[PDB]
Amino acid sequence: LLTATREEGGDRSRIARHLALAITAAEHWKNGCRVVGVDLAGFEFATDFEPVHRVGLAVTVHAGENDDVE
Amino acid sequence: FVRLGPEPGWPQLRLLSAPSFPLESTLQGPVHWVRASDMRLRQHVEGVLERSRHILAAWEGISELPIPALAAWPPSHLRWLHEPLDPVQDKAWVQALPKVELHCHLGGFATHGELLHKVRQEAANPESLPPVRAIPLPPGWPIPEEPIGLERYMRLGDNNGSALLKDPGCLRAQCRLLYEALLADHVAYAEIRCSPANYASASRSPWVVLQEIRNHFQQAMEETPEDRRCHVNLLLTATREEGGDRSRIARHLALAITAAEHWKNGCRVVGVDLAGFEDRTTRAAMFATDFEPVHRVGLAVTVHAGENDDVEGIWQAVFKLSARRLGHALHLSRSPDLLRVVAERGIAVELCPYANLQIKGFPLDEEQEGSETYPLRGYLAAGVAVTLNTDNLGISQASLTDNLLLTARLCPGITRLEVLKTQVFAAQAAFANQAERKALWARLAQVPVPTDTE
Amino acid sequence: LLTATREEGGDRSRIARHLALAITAAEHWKNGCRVVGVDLAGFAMFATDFEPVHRVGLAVTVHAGENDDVEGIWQAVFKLSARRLGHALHLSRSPDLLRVVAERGIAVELCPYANLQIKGFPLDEEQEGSETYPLRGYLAAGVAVTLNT
Amino acid sequence: MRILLCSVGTSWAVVPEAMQLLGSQGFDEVHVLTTASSKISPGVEQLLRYFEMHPGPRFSISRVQDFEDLRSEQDHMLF
Ligand SMILES: Nc1ncnc2c1ncn2[C@@H]1O[C@H](COP(=O)(O)OP(=O)(O)OP(=O)(O)O)[C@@H](O)[C@H]1O
Ligand SMILES: [Zn+2]
């Protein structure tokens, strides 16, 4: 799984390339170890992830350090 | 005694050293008997003085010269440059210019003829080649007697493209032949836009196809002497196919974002060329954050304003996609505000004379400029950065030189200095970095001297 | 240049006033002293508020002040398309944007005294370090850095 | 470093006089430019004797092998 972690006050370039990295490696390997999905260490990006779901990668959100159910 | 005063010297003649032009002397006792091997020194001095005279004569007004190295041209040649271009006599001089290519699709380079056969016979799976269909060209090609339409123009390139390029051998043949065609036309910098996903297979992911194309071009560049090496970068095409298919668009954007960093020398991926079609459902607001990542990483964008965008596309693309180049922006004169925003912001406009003539159709061989006159000179006057390119080599059946010389028929009164200005604008508006730009500028200074001068 | 500055807790009525005034003054005059563009001494996105300004062709400069963020500079360049960034002293902290500002020709207006008095930098240092003024770093990277008052 | 270069003709008393432009200063080395004409050989010998009787700075004499006397423009370009 490829991580796409949000940083508070930092750049969003990493989140920009990890998603592109996954969408490319998802089609590249079809046997053995594969990049099967993506991960989110934040938002706990409804428009950033339009590409991912279109290609067919599963997304696993990570509710990190909060107590909000929204 | 009488003193005539000091002689400070001449800048290009006070640095000379004796060994460069040795003097042969025969010794006879105390008197040296010198001898002159040749009069190379006299010719050296005469050339230096003539070049200095040309520099000083054309010095006043160097700000008007597209290339600062033109100040060494003879004043007669400088007068010649400022005259109208001639399609008949200027074949050779145009053929000798170090040009720049910025709109050249890889999928339409050998769509018909000897090149198509050379590509086909290079396939690694000869029995998997689709049958060569029948695609009669319209009469008068490459100068149609009437516009044929974007649909028909696109359909003319069926023999090549996704039909054949899935085969690695055909892909390699396409790349090598395209590089040869570039070299044979004296192109000092190119940006070939490919569609790797369209050439993918079950066993060949789009990334593998892109890597193979890049490495083929890198190999072709490596074998050529650095004096004639046409630095070629790559642009990925995110075609706005109808229906809403976004799998290929997303794949292409991700592949571009990956290749942008994977390679940092030789052939590279420098941007994307979003087509953004017209039909009121894709336009240029298709952004929807789709092109947000490409901007986020420092890539460039170049739209393909289609066969009827009508000023709204040329604005949606300029101000929402942050496009740094616009293709076929032929209706730009409509809004006098876009023709000024483009000029101020420095957004280059890519034009294709032959493709535009064959699709939209324009008045030809006109004496003056009317309502329907080709907008090349109109764009140049306003200050826009207009560039001339080839679009599809195979389909258009006309090289860069043919496109350049067709302007003199499309735009009455077009001069040669404006051709040089278009070349300089194309060089300056390219997506190269410091090294590529420096090599291109060093290559551009070598303008071929005219054969006539009168 | 008409400074259309947002007010922290203020009213957007002044921003509307200033955008309309600039749009009208742009067309009114064509000789001598003119109205060239609008300065945004309030930058965060202000995207749709500025669509009319671009439609008529006025330039927009983005005024950075008392800031240490690198996303303001990023949204200035791309969302409310700016042609000059004011006081952007922290731009090397994102090597991805010191190469788009340098490639798109987005001038960076540096104020030596203003930036020294607001924040303070090492003075007359023998060799450049990590705290020195970023002028030369911007210049050597191809940035069109200016100097003002 | 100070040097003097001068051509010579039928008046061989030219280089010696010219060598005193700096007067008592003198010159580091003076070279003589000469043609192949035989009317100047006595002048060449006189200059050689003058240099021998006035030692110090280096001296040299060069005669134009292919330029014996001025007849046409080709000799002029060769000179
Ligand atoms: N002049 C043009 N105007 C608009 N779209 C064009 C033009 N030429 C090509 N295209 C489209 O852009 C892409 C061209 O890329 P390329 O030719 O490398 O791929 P392709 O799939 O092999 O193309 P084609 O359908 O021409 O064989 C295709 O989507 C083609 O439809
Ligand atoms: Zn195109």
Regarding beta strands C107-110 and C59-63, do their DSSP bridges make them parallel or antiparallel, or are they unpaired?
Answer: unpaired
Q: What are phi and psi of C37, to 5 degrees?
A: -165, 180
CA of B6 to the centre of ligand 2 (A): 65
DSSP string, A1-70: -EEE---TTS-SHHHHHHHHHHHHHHHH--SSS---EEEES----TTTTHHHHHHT-EEEE---S-----
Q: Residue B263, CB half-sphere, CA atoms under 13 Å: how many?
A: 21
DSSP state of C118: H
* Distance separating alpha carbons of residues D9 and D41, to the nearest angstrom: 10
Tokens of A9: 């006050």
B198 lines ligand 1 (CB under 6 A): yes
Which atom from ligand 1 is nearest to the alpha carbon of B150?
A: 3
Contact between chains at C71 and A13 (C-beta distance less than 8 A)? no
N-to-C CA span, chain A: 25
Regarding beta strands B24-28 and B31-35, do their DSSP bridges make them parallel or antiparallel, or are they unpaired?
Answer: antiparallel
Neighbours of chain A (3+ CB pairs under 8 A): B, C
Neighbours of chain D (3+ CB pairs under 8 A): B
C-alpha dist (Å) from residue B109 to B102, B177, B192, B220, B358: 14, 9, 11, 17, 17
What technique determined this structure?
Answer: cryo-EM
Contacts of B269 by beta carbon, 8 Å cutoff, 6+ apart: B210, B214, B233, B234, B235, B236, B256, B259, B260, B263
Measured by CA distance, the residue closest to atom 25 of ligand 1 is B161
Q: Is A55 exposed, middle or buried (0-12, 13-18, 19+ CB in 10 A)?
A: middle
B392 lines ligand 1 (CB under 6 A): yes
Query: Which of A19, A24, A54 lies closest to B293 in CB terms?
Result: A19
C-alpha dist (Å) from residue C56 to B315, B322, B335, B338, B438: 11, 17, 10, 8, 36
Tokens of B181: 């065609």
Q: Is B198 exposed, middle or buried (0-12, 13-18, 19+ CB in 10 A)?
A: middle
> The tokens 């040329």 sit on which residue?
B314
Tokens of B379: 């764009």
Query: Among this protein's residues, is C71 annotated catalytic?
Result: no
Q: Residue B382, CB half-sphere, CA atoms under 13 Å: how many?
A: 24
Phi-psi category of B398—alpha, beta or left, where left has phi over 0 and alpha has psi -120 to 50? beta
Is A67 within any annotated ligand binding site? no
Contact between chains at A13 and C96 (C-beta distance less than 8 A)? yes
Bond prior to B142 in cis (omega within 30° of 0): yes
Fill in the amino acid letter for B94. V
Contacts of A48 in chain B (CB under 8 A): 289, 292-293
> The tokens 């044979």 sit on which residue?
B184
Q: Residue B28's beta-bridge partner residues? A: B31
C-alpha dist (Å) from residue B55 to B48, B50, B70, B72, B421: 10, 9, 9, 5, 20
The answer to whether B196 and B237 are in contact (CB under 8 A) is: no
* Distance separating alpha carbons of residues B386 and B331, to the nearest angstrom: 14
B32 to chain D, any CB pair closer than 8 A? The answer is yes
C-alpha dist (Å) from residue A35 to A23, A52, B423: 9, 12, 45
Burial D49-77 (b: 16+ CB within 10 A, else e): eebeeeeeeebebbbbbebeeeeeeeeee
Tokens of C131: 């705290």
Query: Which of B297, B298, B319 lies closest to C81 in CB terms?
Result: B319
Q: Which of B385, B411, B413, B359 is nearest to B142 (CA)?
A: B359
B194 lines ligand 1 (CB under 6 A): yes
Residues in chain D: 79
Q: Which of B267, B292, B372 is nearest to C47 (CA)?
A: B292
Regarding beta strands B231-236 and C2-3, do their DSSP bridges make them parallel or antiparallel, or are they unpaired?
Answer: unpaired
Instruction: Give how far the C-alpha of residue B334 lies from the chain's centroid of Cα atoms, to the nearest Å.
Output: 27
Residue B279 sits at the vertex; the CA angle it makes with B273 and B281, to the nearest 5 degrees, is 85
B387 lines ligand 1 (CB under 6 A): no
Tokens of C6: 């947002």
Nearest CA distance, C68 vs chain A (angstrom): 10
Query: Which of B322, B337, B346 lies closest to C55 in CB terms?
Result: B337
Contact between chains at D63 and B31 (C-beta distance less than 8 A)? yes
Fill in the amino acid letter for C67. N
If DSSP states are collapsed to H, E and C, what string results for chain B? CCCCCCCCCCCCCCCCCHHHCCCEEEEECCEEEEECCCCHHHHHHHHHHHHHHHHHHHHCCHHHCCCHHHHHCCHHHHHHHCCECCCCCCHHHHHHCCECCCCEEHHHCCCCCHHHHHHHCCCCCHHHCCCCCCCCCCCCCCCCCCCCCHHHHHHCCCCCCCCCCCCHHHHHHHHHHHHHHHHCCCECEEEEEECHHHHCCCCCCHHHHHHHHHHHHHHHHHHCCHHHCCEEEEEECCCCCCCCCCHHHHHHHHHHHHHHHHCCCCCCEEEECCCCCCCCCCCCHHHCCCCHHHHHCCCEEEECCCCCCCCHHHHHHHHHCCCCEEECCCCCCCCCCHHHHHHHHCCEEEECHHHHHHHCCCCCCCCCCCCCCCCHHHHHHHCCEEEECCECHHHHCCCHHHHHHHHHHHCCCCEHHHHHHHHHHHHHCCCCCHHHHHHHHHHHCCCCCCCCCC
DSSP state of C93: T
The answer to whether C122 and C95 are in contact (CB under 8 A) is: no
Longest dimension (CA), chain D: 41
Q: What are phi and psi of B284, to 5 degrees?
A: -115, -10
Q: Which of C147, D78, C28 is nearest to B41 (CA)?
A: D78
Top mutation candidate among B104, B148, B154, B165 for ligand 1, by most atoms within 8 Å of CB: B154
Is B453 within any annotated ligand binding site? no
Which atom from ligand 1 is nearest to the alpha carbon of B111?
A: 27
* Distance separating alpha carbons of residues B190 and B100, to the nearest angstrom: 6
Contacts of B146 by beta carbon, 8 Å cutoff, 6+ apart: B361
C-alpha dist (Å) from residue C147 to C87, C109, C113: 10, 6, 10
**Contacts of the segment C57-63: beta carbons below 8 A, 24+ positions apart:** C57/B337, C57/B340, C57/B341, C57/B344, C57/C26, C58/C22, C58/C23, C58/C26, C59/B344, C59/C83, C59/C84, C61/C1, C61/C37, C61/C85, C61/C86, C61/C109, C62/C86, C63/C3, C63/C5, C63/C39, C63/C87
B66 lines ligand 1 (CB under 6 A): no
B391 lines ligand 1 (CB under 6 A): yes
Contacts of B44 by beta carbon, 8 Å cutoff, 6+ apart: B21
* Distance separating alpha carbons of residues C60 and B109, to the nearest angstrom: 43
* Distance separating alpha carbons of residues B388 and D8, to the nearest angstrom: 65
Edge-to-edge strand ranges of the sheet holding A37-40: A2-4, A37-40, A58-61
Q: Which ligand is nearest to the CA of B302?
A: 2
> The tokens 């339009």 sit on which residue?
A50
Is C39 within any annotated ligand binding site? yes
Contact between chains at B289 and A48 (C-beta distance less than 8 A)? yes
> The tokens 């899935």 sit on which residue?
B166
Fill in the amino acid letter for B284. A
Enumerate residues 12 to 51 of chain D having a beta carbon within 8 A of any beta carbon in chain B.
18, 21, 34, 44, 48
Q: Is A43 exposed, middle or buried (0-12, 13-18, 19+ CB in 10 A)?
A: middle
CA of B106 to the centre of ligand 1 (A): 8
Tokens of B281: 């459902």
The answer to whether B284 and B254 are in contact (CB under 8 A) is: no
Is C11 within any annotated ligand binding site? no
Q: Which of B40, B6, B74, B158 is nearest to B452 (CA)?
A: B74
The answer to whether B79 and B416 are in contact (CB under 8 A) is: no
Detail the DSSP E strand segments found in C87-128.
Answer: 107-110
Q: Residue B128, CB half-sphere, CA atoms under 13 Å: how many?
A: 12
Contacts of C1 by beta carbon, 8 Å cutoff, 6+ apart: C35, C36, C37, C38, C39, C61
Is B337 within any annotated ligand binding site? no
Regarding beta strands A58-61 and A37-40, do their DSSP bridges make them parallel or antiparallel, or are they unpaired?
Answer: parallel
Nearest CA distance, D64 vs chain B (angstrom): 7
B26 to chain D, any CB pair closer than 8 A? The answer is yes
DSSP state of D77: H
Contacts of C56 in chain B (CB under 8 A): 337
* Distance separating alpha carbons of residues D59 and D27, to the nearest angstrom: 10
The answer to whether B191 and B104 are in contact (CB under 8 A) is: yes
Rg from Cα positions in chain A: 13
Is B108 within any annotated ligand binding site? yes
Contact between chains at C70 and A11 (C-beta distance less than 8 A)? yes
Instruction: Give how far the C-alpha of residue B82 lies from the chain's centroid of Cα atoms, to the nearest Å.
Output: 22
C-alpha dist (Å) from residue B221 to B17, B194, B227, B389, B426: 39, 18, 11, 21, 21
Contact between chains at A47 and B293 (C-beta distance less than 8 A)? no
Instruction: Give how far the C-alpha of residue B194 lies from the chain's centroid of Cα atoms, to the nearest Å.
Output: 16
Q: What are phi and psi of B275, to 5 degrees?
A: -70, -50
Q: Which member of C8, C27, C51, C66 is catalytic?
A: C66
* Distance separating alpha carbons of residues B428 and B426, to the nearest angstrom: 6
* Distance separating alpha carbons of residues A36 and D69, to the nearest angstrom: 97
Q: Which of B330, B399, B426 is nearest to B104 (CA)?
A: B399
* Distance separating alpha carbons of residues C141 and B434, to the nearest angstrom: 10
Kind and range of the H or E run holding C59 = strand C59-63
Query: Which of B295, B298, B319 lies closest to C99 in CB terms?
Result: B298
Q: Which of D79, D69, D67, D17 is nearest to D47 (CA)?
A: D17
Measured by CA distance, the residue closest to atom 22 of ligand 1 is B161
Q: Residue D33's beta-bridge partner residues? A: D7, D62
C-alpha dist (Å) from residue C99 to B133, B394, C56, C94: 48, 36, 29, 9
DSSP state of D7: E
Q: Which of B406, B400, B439, B402 is nearest to B423 (CA)?
A: B400
Contact between chains at B298 and C97 (C-beta distance less than 8 A)? yes
* Distance separating alpha carbons of residues B96 and B447, to the nearest angstrom: 8
B258 lines ligand 1 (CB under 6 A): no
C-alpha dist (Å) from residue C48 to B245, B268, C9, C53, C79: 28, 36, 20, 10, 10
Query: Which of C51, C57, C103 lies closest to B341 in CB terms?
Result: C57
DSSP state of D66: S
| CA dihedral over C74, C75, C76, C78, signed as positive or negative | positive
